[PDB]
Ligand binder design. Structure first.
Ligand SMILES: O=P(O)(O)O[C@@H]1[C@H](O)[C@H](O)[C@@H](OP(=O)(O)O)[C@H](OP(=O)(O)O)[C@H]1O
Length: 1257
């Protein structure tokens, strides 16, 4: 008849005194029960996916059971016992696939495996059970042990061991050694009508009810119960179910990612109900149970439309497929109705929604094609092992808001809020952790499955394992996850009281502090002078107060900050003593050196605490260099010191330079300096990884060959460094290298910059180099990538002093050494008064030392030195020009005082553009903040007129400065954000700005329509410009029409035609007949210039991507209607600026008849031009005699054309034997001396013109 097999999926139905279908209580609770009333044979359980199992051969638990004795100090013996538990664990997978399908046979030793929870049924021999007192504890263990082997055997003696098992047979399962047979209890659990199954010799009879037979070739085939998402072929959109307006709606969901297929949520997942007849396992129909709610899908009231139905029974919840295979791309058909599905664009209150309704149509299409994207089974068990969590905190957060919870529930919830930690980090944290790194897909599975929501509706009403243990879960799921962080605001202020009962809420606000930088710092504020004083007066160890200290990041933190320091001098009530002033401290040290406990222990705390925050002082040095008195560092330790001298140094000497030099020399060198400069540039610049820099490290170890007070610490250094060279003679950077290579670390780099701030141009700084050579040479997988982040930085401090020296300090003398003669008498080396401008420019560095509190020396003395700059702006670029930029950098803080500009204004006085603006993009991300703040207030004035000047500068330069804008970081953000504020504002003539800082960026090699390929995407997303009745603000029009030209004006795609046609389209021309003289006259006293620029804007449509403008059939869709309308604008005068609208309309007028061949059917356009070119006054023809001679040759080539365009063009043959005969210009201007090339290119352009005419039309 019909047999059971290894592979079949069935159900087992208990037939003793309590009946049922076994089932779990979720992926949280590892128990097993019989829901007697949850279903019967005749009426199957409604969740008959959690009462399903797979029949497994016998598994191997000896080397894995050996591996569950982690009785060993040894580490090589542990990695051994594992490689045997994992080889075993894969020998199981191997052997289990061959045996796939066998007639099982009675008295085989099978185990049983849960599909939905993917854990093995297992008898825990050495336990009692929970609801029953004798029976062993039957649990669901994920990987199994010997306690999951089950002897299957026939209950009745109808069949008997040694025949092959039939389907249905009642059987008893009997573990191989764990003792007694499985048995469905009589004992309702506590919480749930759920009888707890356990092991105890009993007369229960297990029927075996098949579900799928062992033919489900997957993920190979779509068979009933596979979880899939349903992607859209045309629309490129997944199929989802949610609620809008408190109503369940299905829809297609829109994504803003830049990779459609990277939009995965746990709500587009649909269970497949391969409809059968009884509840079991491409020509038959299908139903989609929405994988999240439990509501199927069904199309009800395009004749019909899709929405969720609570029960998937109604014939409506049945469909039919059209091209089975896993990952098929199908078209589907709603059965009851006979219609084929279709996606609209009317959505369901929001501003810019996302939910696009989906409906049906009796018309079968070809593009509405969906993709049966199969879901990974783990992800399905992820959504599983979270929903549980949502409903666990749904009982417990419900039972503790209105009253009390037992001692069994605390133990299981606390447990829960440890497991989730064990989830969200992709199995890394938990306890005594080593690492703690997040896993993204789970975090999204929390805000979307209201784990988070549950959490905040739990805290709100001992707790020592509830809060802030939640609050560390919250510290894991918002990690580097913006969208989930835009939630802790109202929550952030639990961190306070949750910071009490435990400093765990501390963890969060610093996970805050850093990223939530800038904007975290404004809400604490003086709050802090009451949460360290508190955190000091309650957190006796004061952890809170400390990692607070460790949280300070960004210049703007120093303020509010320094305030608490003062509380500290009123708060030094630590009830202990420290003094000597060299002895009893020192003695202190000989004593905590003792690794003894309690006392010695303590020292670590105030030691770190001093190092970090006391050095904390960076360039607030003054506050730092005033708070850090006596300079001591004999015993230096962990880097504390290196930091402190930073604190003091800032007070003294912002070092700067300029780059040593300039001119052709630096080259002759570097070239002389050959690759070298390159080999090391890659390793540090790149080779963040060890290996790559390692190679340039071989390329090294072959080679072959008045400071006074700032000095008196420097020497103790060089000795110590040699030390690093004497410890260096010691290869091992083992344990030592934690201490040494930290203290070091804090040394290595701060020394890079200490040689860039304290060398000397005599044989000393260098000869010290010499000794450093022998220093730097004295020093040259596994847990060493967590350590090798730190190694990576060390090699930076290395190659860092190394390059600040070796690159830019290095080689400075051989230079001035080589002075001799060259031609003019032996002259060996042993802009006018360059001095005066470099000692007003030193009046400058002294400028660079001063500050705003200095009201006396602030305004009166310095003044606008800018005049010197403005006056020497024409003269050649000094070398201490990067030392100029010294001054520049400082003003990046702020500018309220009107004063800035006049001084700031000297800088504008510049005449070595290219080279600088290379150094000026230094601020590109800041100065992008200068256009985004300068832009939220423009369209104190020095930051928008200065971020614009900076812009026309990185705008009137190289084609490479153009590509360098490289403004994915951030164009689309300076056009979308400068617009955003800057569209709705527009400034009237004459002073008005939106047009020069969005009009010096698109200087695309000073015409024509090219190299602006970036201008289809940033011009892609934007808000448009006004239209129809009314009017708007002036200038930023003139600006706009032009600006559009250069964004969608490139010549290369077919867009450009629909682009200078999408929007204004043909329709624009109409409104350009009358009324913009009116918006320019309400626009500004000079009405007719914003109008006349409105006229170079409407006449230049042919000029930019004309060629392209035509693109596809652009001269066929407005043929006829633009030429006649043009006669409507055929007359004008007094046009110097509008005659740049008559050379931007003689370029505009040149782009009417350069491309046509069977489209022209109008008359008379030819006399009118001739008339307009004769009616001229003002400027020497030569530009209107190369635009009208340029007209006279572009006309004179055609020939038989015009000979259809009008009756004759005979006034046009005298007129080009004039704009071409001319005079010395036309009388006596005599301004051109490349005549022979004039007459030449004009007589090989009169020879190219001669070849043409023969082919006229
Ligand atoms: O840019 P960020 O800061 O990474 O933030 C993502 C961005 O807003 C995506 O557009 C969004 O996808 P949708 O547009 O499809 O929502 C995604 O949501 P998700 O994390 O929920 O996928 C966000 O995390």
């Amino acid at each position: 008849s019909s047999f059971l097999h290894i592979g079949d999926i069935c159900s087992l139905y208990a037939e003793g005194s309590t009946n049922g279908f076994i089932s779990t209580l979720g992926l949280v609770d590892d128990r097993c029960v019989v829901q007697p009333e949850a279903g019967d044979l005749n009426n199957p359980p409604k969740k008959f996916r959690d009462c399903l199992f797979k029949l497994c051969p016998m598994n191997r638990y000896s080397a894995q059971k050996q591996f569950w004795k982690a009785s060993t100090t040894d580490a090589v013996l542990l990695n051994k016992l594992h490689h045997a538990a994992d080889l075993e664990k894969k020998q199981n997978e191997t052997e289990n696939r061959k045996l796939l399908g066998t007639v099982i046979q009675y008295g085989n030793v099978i185990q049983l495996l849960h599909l939905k929870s993917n854990k093995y049924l297992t008898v825990n021999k050495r336990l009692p059970a929970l609801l029953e007192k004798n029976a062993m504890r039957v649990t669901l263990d994920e990987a199994g042990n010997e306690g999951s082997w089950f002897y299957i055997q026939p209950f009745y003696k109808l069949r008997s061991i040694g025949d092959s098992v039939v389907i249905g047979d009642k059987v008893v399962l009997n573990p191989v050694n764990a003792g007694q047979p499985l048995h469905a209890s009589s004992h309702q659990l506590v919480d749930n009508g759920c009888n707890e199954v356990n092991s105890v010799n009993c007369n229960t009879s297990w029927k075996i009810v098949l579900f799928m037979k062992w033919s489900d070739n997957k993920d190979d085939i779509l068979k009933g119960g596979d979880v899939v998402r349903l992607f859209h072929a045309e629309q490129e959109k997944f199929l989802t179910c949610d609620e809008h307006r408190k109503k369940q709606h299905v829809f297609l969901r829109t994504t803003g990612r830049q990779s459609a297929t990277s939009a995965t949520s746990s709500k587009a997942l649909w269970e497949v109900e391969v409809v059968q007849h009884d509840p079991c396992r491409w020509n038959s129909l299908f139903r989609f149970k929405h994988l999240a709610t439990g509501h199927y899908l069904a199309a009800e009231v395009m004749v019909y439309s899709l929405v969720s139905v609570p029960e998937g029974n109604d014939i409506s919840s049945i469909f039919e497929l059209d091209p089975v295979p896993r990952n098929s791309y199908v078209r589907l058909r709603h059965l009851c109705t006979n219609t084929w599905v279709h996606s609209t664009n009317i959505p369901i209150e929001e501003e810019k929604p996302v939910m696009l309704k989906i409906g049906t149509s009796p018309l079968k299409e070809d593009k509405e094609a969906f993709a049966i994207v199969p879901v990974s089974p783990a992800e399905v068990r992820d959504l599983d092992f979270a929903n549980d969590a949502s409903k666990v905190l749904g009982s417990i957060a419900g039972k503790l808001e209105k009253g009390t919870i037992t001692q069994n529930e605390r133990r299981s919830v606390t447990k829960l809020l440890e497991d989730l930690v064990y989830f969200v980090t992709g199995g890394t944290n938990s306890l005594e952790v080593v690492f703690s790194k997040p896993n993204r897909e789970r975090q999204k599975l929390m805000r979307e499955q209201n784990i988070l929501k549950q959490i905040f509706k739990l805290l709100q009403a001992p707790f020592r394992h509830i809060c802030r243990l939640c609050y560390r879960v919250l510290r894991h799921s918002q990690q580097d996850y913006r969208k989930n962080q835009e939630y802790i605001a109202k929550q952030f202020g639990f961190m306070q009281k949750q910071i009490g009962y435990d400093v765990l809420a501390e963890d969060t606000i610093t996970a805050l502090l850093h990223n939530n930088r800038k904007l975290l710092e404004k809400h604490i504020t003086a709050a802090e002078i009451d949460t360290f004083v508190s955190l000091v007066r309650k957190n006796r160890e004061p952890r809170f107060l400390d990692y607070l200290s460790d949280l300070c990041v960004s210049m703007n933190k120093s303020i509010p900050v320094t305030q608490e320091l003062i509380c500290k001098a009123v708060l030094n009530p630590t009830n202990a003593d420290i003094l000597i002033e060299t002895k009893l401290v020192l003695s202190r040290f000989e004593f905590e050196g003792v690794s003894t406990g309690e006392n010695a222990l303590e020292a670590g705390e105030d030691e770190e605490e001093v190092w970090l925050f006391w050095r904390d002082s960076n360039k607030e040095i003054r506050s730092k260099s005033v708070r850090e008195l006596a300079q001591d560092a004999k015993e230096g330790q962990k880097e504390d010191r290196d930091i402190l001298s930073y604190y003091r140094y800032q007070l003294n000497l912002f070092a700067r330079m300029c780059l040593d030099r300039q001119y052709l020399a630096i080259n002759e060198i570097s070239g002389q300096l050959d690759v070298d400069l390159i080999l090391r540039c890659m390793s540090d610049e790149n080779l963040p990884y060890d290996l790559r820099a390692s190679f340039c490290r071989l390329m090294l170890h072959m080679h072959v060959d008045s400071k006074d007070e700032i000095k008196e610490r420097f020497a103790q250094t060089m000795e110590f460094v040699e030390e690093y060279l004497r410890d260096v003679v010691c290869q091992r950077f083992p344990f030592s290298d934690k201490e040494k290579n930290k203290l070091t670390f804090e040394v290595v780099n701060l020394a890079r910059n200490l040689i860039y701030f304290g060398f000397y141009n005599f044989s000393d700084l260098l000869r010290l180099t010499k000794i450093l050579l022998a220093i730097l040479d004295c020093v040259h997988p596994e847990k060493e990538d967590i350590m090798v982040m730190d190694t990576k930085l060390k090699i930076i401090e290395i190659l860092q002093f190394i390059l600040n020296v070796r690159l830019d300090y290095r080689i400075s003398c051989l230079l001035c050494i080589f002075k001799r003669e060259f031609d003019e008498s032996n002259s060996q080396s042993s802009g006018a008064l360059d001095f005066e401008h470099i000692e007003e420019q030193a009046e400058g560095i002294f400028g660079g030392s001063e500050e705003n509190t200095p009201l006396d020396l602030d305004d009166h003395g310095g003044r606008t030195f800018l005049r010197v700059l403005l006056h020497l702006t024409m003269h050649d670029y000094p070398p201490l020009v990067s030392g100029a930029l010294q001054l520049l950098f400082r003003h990046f803080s702020q500018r309220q005082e009107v004063l800035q500009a006049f001084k700031q204004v000297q800088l504008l006085v510049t005449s070595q553009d290219v080279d600088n603006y290379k150094q000026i993009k230094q601020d590109l991300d800041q100065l992008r903040s200068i256009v985004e703040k300068s832009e939220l207030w423009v369209y104190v004035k020095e930051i928008l007129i200065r971020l614009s000047k900076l812009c026309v500068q990185e705008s009137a330069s190289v084609r490479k400065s153009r590509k360098q804008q490289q403004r994915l970081l951030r164009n689309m953000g300076a056009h979308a954000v400068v617009l955003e504020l800057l569209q709705i504002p527009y400034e009237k003539a004459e002073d008005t700005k939106m047009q020069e800082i969005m009009r010096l960026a698109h200087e695309f090699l000073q015409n024509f329509c090219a190299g602006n390929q970036q201008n289809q995407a940033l011009l892609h997303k934007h808000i448009n410009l006004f239209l129809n009745p009314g009017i708007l603000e002036a200038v930023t029009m003139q600006h706009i029409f032009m600006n559009n030209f250069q964004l969608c004006s490139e010549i290369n795609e077919r867009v450009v035609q629909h682009f200078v046609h999408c929007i204004e389209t043909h329709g624009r021309n109409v409104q350009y007949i009358k009324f913009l003289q009116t918006i320019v006259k309400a626009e500004g006293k000079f009405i007719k210039k914003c109008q006349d620029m409105v006229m170079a804007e409407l006449v230049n449509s042919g000029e930019d991507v004309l060629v392209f403008y035509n693109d596809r059939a652009s001269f066929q869709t407005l043929i006829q209607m633009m030429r006649s309308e043009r006669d409507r604008m055929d007359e004008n005068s007094p046009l110097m600026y509008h005659i740049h609208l008559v050379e931007l309309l003689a370029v505009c007028t040149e782009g009417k008849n350069v491309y046509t061949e069977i489209k022209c059917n109008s008359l008379l356009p030819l006399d009118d031009i001739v008339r307009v070119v004769t009616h001229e006054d003002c400027i020497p023809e030569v530009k209107i005699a190369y635009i009208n001679f340029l007209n006279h040759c572009y006309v004179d080539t055609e020939v038989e054309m015009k000979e259809i365009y009008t009756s004759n063009h005979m006034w046009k043959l005298f007129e080009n034997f004039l704009v071409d005969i001319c005079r010395a210009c036309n009388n006596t201007s005599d301004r051109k001396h490349a005549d022979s090339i004039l007459e030449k290119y004009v007589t090989e352009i009169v020879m190219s013109i001669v070849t043409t005419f023969f082919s006229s039309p």
